[model samples]
Target: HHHHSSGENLYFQGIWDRMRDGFQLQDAISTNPRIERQRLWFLSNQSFLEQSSARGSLYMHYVVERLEERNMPLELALLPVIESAYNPFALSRSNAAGLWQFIPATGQHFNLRQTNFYDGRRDITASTNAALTYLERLHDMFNGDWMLALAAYNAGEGTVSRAIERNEKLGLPTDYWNLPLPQETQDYVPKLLALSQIVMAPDSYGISLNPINNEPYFQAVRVKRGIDLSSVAALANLDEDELYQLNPAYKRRVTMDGPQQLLVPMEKAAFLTASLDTLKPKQQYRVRSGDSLHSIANRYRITVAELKSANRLSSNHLRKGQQLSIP
Candidate 1:
């Protein structure tokens, strides 16, 4: 990565240089169907590198790890490169989550658990597992053709299957491009291939992406009980989102109020554990029969919507004994 030699602002020049090397103009422009009419696609734009590299790095690494775990083809992992650019937090207007951009129903089918405290669907580990599992299942259903499976991933298996049936009835090829599908689906496959080509031949493109360095950087820690996120972050010298990013299972600041599965950067877990007995701990709210979301928000000096959104709950269903984030 290249830092700027001279500029009014400090910037990472390496990103643009890497992008220039990584994403070849001719290759991406030729392959990306979305840019059929244009010689210079968005990938070649300098802004694209800054906007995409953050998410792309995460996506590539997670895909690499997941592929290793499953012995799946590395190319299959490239699918999300075009889906959400590897953004685990990139949500569609449709409320999809994680690198694979799974919708809620599809996420649930693969056992990505969700609660007020946590949504496994947004979690890297859980979502990656679910994505691979879903891909494998789709591959099996599609007779081991990855292109068809990739199409199913974008359009839903039933939709893809129906399209295949229609094409068969109409005497058209059942191949991905030949089958009738949504415009988004039509572009999804080609975008993936274009990215693969870009990454595969960065020098030809005059773009160079940083060689994503894979590192084992996180660890799980058990709190004696639940604790407030602010206090935990303070003790660990970390941002709250950094903690939540790992343990998205906690919808609220407090983790003890829920399933208690928490992850933190391994280096900080020990500091947290050592300081936990007295780190300005937060209060826990155990729901009572009379408690309503509105009432709880009023009681906590927070909003009902904030409570629901934090916990990913749609309704004001406060079951007795349910614990919620007070801070």
Candidate 2:
């Protein structure tokens, strides 16, 4: 049975069903006798057995969705696990940033924008696209060996290929371990394999991964005018920060009107459907049958003079159809 399918078929599907794409689980892995390779897979699975963190879940979700959307084999999504542990905001000591953790130059190459208010590299959606595009390009450059492509992503293809050349001269295996890799590069493949091992057997690692619900979670709201945030929160009955996090594109508290965009929770779109009047100082207050503007102003604790000024009232005496503002 596959981890995703059980009961009727308990004999179990091969690891391929769980490991999926971006993984090389063919006979080669089973035939390899290297302790380091085995250790790499072991630790990756061990982390999951420990129920590690939600970080892996998010990455796995992104990988599956990205690959599915692009019609690419889904295995490529595991690449990020080696890069950033699935953390969108993860920053390495060397300053690689975002989920796929591209450094500035690479981020620019992929057109992942960075600004004071918004960093597309850290955006789970955008960065996933950029990372996959980069991987595809690397795969093309390396003649389609995904492991070699991924090694190029880490230590640079030039470095990996040169290491292979050097290893070949010494009559050694030209594989990743047989080649000379920097310490960081050496751990890179193992780390990725480790993550794959863990995710494939999450239950064994103690993590009950929440099922991925392949549905949209948010919607983009267009702002055609400058809007006071207080009004948005009141009308939507949502916290300002909640809106801010969803609409990280906005640099300010209030959204400026024009051809601008903001992300709103998919479920909260209705509450934010139109212009909200809650922030307007003057609201509709019915006048008593005999009440005059001056008297009504006094009742609401405002002087008639202030009420007229605020509401643009021309006369102190108000009739049945008259509407006045309260200060």
Candidate 3:
């Protein structure tokens, strides 16, 4: 026997409710003129908020899951809204990409691999882990002060440290508010705080947050071989743009050679999995005398590190006509 209800399920709650339940930064939040202004600005831009929230529904579960695992503030899940408006394909003039907005140098420092075929900076799973690692490192460096850590995340650690030292030398308080920082850096923390406040009390501010189901929206589909992104979409019966949105790290239409994973809609996960089982692996590449590991990897749009690891090569030394796994 089964039950059906035409009426709405009153017992069910949305992602916002889960976030509010996990709110732990209440003590750290404070109001100021700048924050009030940002708060009003957000409230006024209802369309942006709604769109951003809707977009976030696709990926917020993953972010919130990581945040909860790390015992971090749930408000951090909303950080993507401020960073990229929840757009996975978002790229900045400064070369930051994805929901986390990691710059190249920083992304590499955190072990986010970048290659011609794929840029880990825009990979939702990779970038989220990298961003949180950076944030947690910053938090530790700033003596467990999230505000200073957030400020440093916007600016640089060196910039924040220098400001703190200058304040100390001048015999002034070395807090985030007291330190002299860039105007954008100064506004950054307040903006997050303002957004946090609005998320916590949307109704009070006359803002309506779209309802996102408090459950996983997607499942990870393990990709074992290189294939065109469009092929995956077609096999899974998913729209190509939606597929691109979920896996924007792939710079080319085709995936990188090797084992990887794609986030597909939960309903389509089984189909994608079944399709993957029927597909063949990538073709192999034979080594030539003139080719170094770097050249070979470059030709294939993968990394030398990946090439070596894939073939279990001790070094880049290669002989003519040596066969190696492309991935």
Candidate 4:
């Protein structure tokens, strides 16, 4: 916990730094043979893991922050890497879909609405919330055994429970490894277990993980008016392809009627005003030694309170060469 040699930026360099302290279970089951076998798989298939994280880089920051907020072990953030290569549009033969790979039955149970225009399954924010809730429920159902909970996540909770009961009836160990389960479930847990160790031991495994900014990839911007993603992208000076990639939930690539959010990068977010209608772009005033909030507000024909509110200032003190975000 004392690795803050550089203060806040300590967590800002590699997304991995903030995440490393949250892993307790990664090393907990390292010696298991199944995990060892899968670890070798990752060791040999290095590029598979690399491609998964790199493609999902935009969403990892958001997922990790939510995981920390929910006290979820950071290992689960890597769940998508295995489930779908972190691809939002990934689909399976069972009709399981999206980053969490929720099937239609389970997705509807979680209130993830599927519409002709939008799929909650693919909505990054909505699906993550539902998936988090499901995991917590499974965690409680398995009596806080995260290993069992994760097993249930891949193979249905009922299936895991039945297998546990079968072992219980035979007076055999009812642990995840001892229970008879589907071949996919058997490999599923082992694959994630392998990754848990590999992530922390990247150097030992001779693998490389690309750097990602530790801050949020996008900010939620609500727009009630009709707008195509291309125009929306142009408004924020963003690429249309990039905009669509962040918000793949919109099937038509257009914001349907009613209020919906558009994910905008923080740097480009300020370019937008209150609504679709263009307002005069905001003007910034640099502070000089003689400048005061009262004087600056007067020169701008606005109140000091308005200026302060726009600049989000708590103090009246002015510093020379300070760039204030104008309202």
> Which consecutive 10 residues in model 2 have the weakest lDDT in total?
1-10
Show the colliding residue pairs in model 2. 1-12, 21-75, 22-75, 22-76, 44-194, 48-205, 49-205, 224-258, 225-257, 226-257
Tens digit per residue, CA lDDT, model 3, 44-135 = 78787788888999998788778777878877888899999999888888888789999889888977788888888888888999889899
**Which residue pairs in candidate 4 have backbone atoms (N, alpha carbon, C) closer than 3 angstroms, thus clashing?**
none
- Per-residue alpha-carbon lDDT of candidate 4 for residues 1-327, written as tens digits (9 for 90 to 100): 222332554445678766666676764684678888898888888888889988778788888878877878778888999998989989999988889899998999987778777787888888888899999999999999888999999999999999998898999999999988998999888888789777777787777777876777788876654578877776677799887778877878777632377777777666654555552212777798899998888888888878888886657898888888666
Indicate the residue-level lDDT of 28 in model 1: 24
* lDDT of the candidates, in the order given: 0.65, 0.60, 0.82, 0.80
Q: Among all windows of ten consecutive residues in candidate 4, which has the lowest summed lDDT? A: 1-10
lDDT of 1 at 34: 47
True-structure RMSD, every candidate = 12.9, 8.0, 12.6, 12.4
Report the lDDT of model 1 for residue 25.
25
- Candidate 2 residue lDDT tens string, 199-310: 5665665544444444444565655446655557666787877665454434555554212555566677755545443334226665557997667877888887777777
Rank candidates, lDDT, best first: 3, 4, 1, 2
* Segments in model 2 whose C-alpha atoms lie over 4 Å from true places: 1-28, 31-62, 71-73, 78-82, 204-207, 210-214, 220-235, 239-261, 269-327
In order of appearance, the predictions have TM-scores of 0.67, 0.63, 0.81, 0.80
Backbone collisions counted per model: 20, 10, 0, 0
Tens-digit lDDT track of model 1 for 136-234: 899899998777888889889999999999999999889776887898787666666555555555677776665444443465566645577776787
